[PDB]
Amino acid sequence: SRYTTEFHELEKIGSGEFGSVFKCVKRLDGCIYAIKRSKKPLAGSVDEQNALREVYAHAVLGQHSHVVRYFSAWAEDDHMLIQNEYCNGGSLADAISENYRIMSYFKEAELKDLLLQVGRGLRYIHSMSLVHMDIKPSNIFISKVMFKIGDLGHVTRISSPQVEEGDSRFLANEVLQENYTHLPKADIFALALTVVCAAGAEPLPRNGDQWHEIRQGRLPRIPQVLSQEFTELLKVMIHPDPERRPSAMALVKHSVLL
Template sequence: MVSRYKKEFLELEKIGVGEFGSVYKCIKRLDGCVYAIKRSKRRLAGSSDEQMALREVYAHAVLGHHPHVVRYYSAWAEDGHMIIQNEHCNGGSLQDVVLENSKKADYFKESELKDILLQVSMGLKYIHASGLVHMDIKPSNIFICRKLFGPTGQEESDNEDDGFASSNVIYKIGDLGHVTSVNNPQVEEGDSRFLANEVLQEQYCYLSKADIFALALTIAIAAGCGSLPANGTVWHHIREGNLPPIPQQLSHSFTELLKLMIHPDPVMRPSATALTKHPVLRPSLGKAALLQKQLDVERFRTMTHICLGLPSGEDYKIFQNSKGTHIHGCTSKKASNTIHSRPCKWSCRHPCTWSSGKPCSPPLS
């Protein structure tokens, strides 16, 4: 029987080896596109890889397509091995870049670290909203897609919505072999270097916050902190809420956010949704919210003028009748420009506007 893999794909090179198996860069003969093909190390039947392979396929089936999750296309068994066809990320993994940076003592700048954190948080937000948790967030499971530009300078991409139009680098979560359901967790612990203490203690009430913990340490690695311990005193020191030493000066606000993400109490850690809106990562959202608030106030003021039949403008007077004629049920000449909610005892349809707060006098006949 002809192998589907050999029939449909032209293998170019091996691009990775992981816990599950090897990953190959291949061209699909039918469409000419490049894909990442993952092949399990051992035959699945009766092996420890079987459950991991099924977890990954099931997770992809539930998740569908999201710009910050590596895209899944197909999976099949061949000679007892599981083969998974995924999107090829042309920038490799975050771990690949970290290793290259370490050789030159070069690290991601804070702006780049924030970009990574924000984009991966978007992917986690989607995964968590689908009722799943990743359980193995780390640099080798964060993949990089660099936008390609053709001769005309226009972007060449088959991505319908990369979710980050302003960035030339897209970060995506991959390797879903440890994914489990929040409601019915079947936890297979991931890399112990990134493992939250509550998971080790088999406390599974806040599994989504374990992903947040691992993401903070992933950012610390990208910032240049070096290798993390798999156990021991330093391992426990980090689980007490202490960041590993980072060889560059980060802003106080960003450092505090990372510390919050590894807080010993998972309840105190921000959710992925909160991170996608956090002012440290999205300062423009805070400015937009303030502007919206100001617009709402101005809109309310304008509508109030319309309802009361009053002229608009900064310098207006609610009561302008010099003879004290009752206007809208109120006759006080001492009325201020500030509207408050004290009701008029004379059944005025509008709020009393006397700054002293005293009731309005009865309407003149």
């Protein structure tokens, strides 16, 4: 086996339904990588196509500072593996839980900077005529800290007529209602919520009354003082009218981000 023969497995850092993720050192280049090892879905089936799109997307989103680099992907003999860049600072999710336990969140300067960087990662993706569809703190990773979008498992072409939904906590309603005219804006919606989490909000709701309020374009309580301008940027990012949310390009050129 190539995984065993080419890498030294250091530690498990991720455990899913389908997969697992390991910190490993490539024996030949001495260098450390994150490798997701997951079940090989039956050749030529809906689930296979899902896994292949991930490999396809990683393979074209490899020039970017705000997307995790892909090094390789292979299959053996009942598993599928992808070898990506390892991010020494771990995930945005874990930084936010640590933050939450200590009552010390991302400051406004840090939140702008997270939004700008991830916004740059999205701009890129959208310019590759793709969309990510599952932006959330556990799919953002950290390496001046660099934030990098990871987990392209939901990535699809911008004008897809069929879509798998990302996490409901971060899901725009128009997508829930199978309206796929402005998918790039689904990522914009999720980015804002991600940044809301970064600011120290309570865990986001999955369903029920509070799930809908936000989808009306109402921000969750943020336990700290943010400038009105920045709060406005945030609000417009979760606007019920996806056309009213700024593209990623608008996002990174926004004055509040200069």
